[PDB]
């Protein structure tokens, strides 16, 4: 948000330093970087910015962005997921099964080579297990398959 305030040059005979409610200055020095901001603490002293929010506005922005990311009438996209679960999912299920064969026959080399090299030293090379993400996609498969009974019946 970043706001500023200009200082004069006539009042450098006098001081510049009453700074009431000291917390604001020590808060100003933390959001902060540079050599040139450090060179522009002269001619500039900032000022704290804060935020007050209408609970009406907060709650209707919550309406918008926790309700309107769900879509209209709210059944519509979940029944569309139910449309996915019998026509499109089996193709990415084939992709999942091919990944969970091909990645697996080389990630069974991994505890072998853990026993081989050392007790757990530095990163040897490229690949990893990465199975957890593919399993989470399979969890998406099962949850939207659970959606089928709920939506389709009644």
């Amino acid at each position: 948000i970043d706001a500023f305030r200009l200082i004069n040059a006539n009042m450098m005979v006098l001081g510049h330093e009453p700074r009431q409610t000291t917390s604001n200055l020590g808060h100003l020095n933390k959001p902060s970087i540079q050599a040139l901001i450090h060179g522009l603490n002269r001619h500039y002293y900032s000022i704290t910015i804060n935020y007050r929010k209408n609970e009406l506005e907060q709650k209707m922005l919550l309406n918008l962005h926790k309700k309107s990311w769900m879509e209209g009438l709210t059944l519509q996209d979940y029944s569309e997921h139910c449309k996915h679960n019998e026509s499109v999912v089996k193709e990415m299920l084939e992709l999942a099964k091919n990944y969970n064969k091909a990645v697996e026959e080389e990630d069974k080399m991994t505890p072998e080579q853990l026993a081989i090299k050392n007790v757990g030293k530095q990163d040897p090379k490229r690949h990893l297990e990465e199975h957890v993400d593919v399993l989470m996609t399979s969890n998406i498969v099962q949850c939207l398959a659970a959606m089928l009974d709920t939506v389709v019946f009644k």
Binding site: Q142, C143, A145, A146, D149, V152
Partner: protein, 85 residues
């Protein structure tokens, strides 16, 4: 406890049986116990034959008790995979 054992296992695939063999197995040649079985039970006393009726299940509506017990079970799968504390 054998009388009601025959009166239990009668309802199976005895699709028709002649009466005097049931007289042999049950007991009591021409009794009023034949009235007891043929009336308290089904097995309609027709011509020389206890007749077998038919009953069905169709599994029609369920389709839904499958669907709601799967609602329970997959809410359970998602619930245990869900946990976090």
């Amino acid at each position: 406890t054998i009388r009601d054992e025959i009166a239990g296992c009668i309802e199976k695939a005895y699709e028709k049986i002649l009466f005097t063999e049931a007289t042999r197995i049950l007991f009591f040649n021409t009794p009023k116990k034949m009235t007891d079985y043929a009336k308290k039970r089904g097995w309609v006393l027709g011509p020389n034959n206890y007749y077998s009726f038919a009953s069905q299940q169709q599994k029609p509506e369920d389709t839904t008790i499958p669907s709601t017990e799967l609602a329970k079970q997959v809410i359970e799968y998602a619930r245990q995979l869900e946990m976090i504390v």
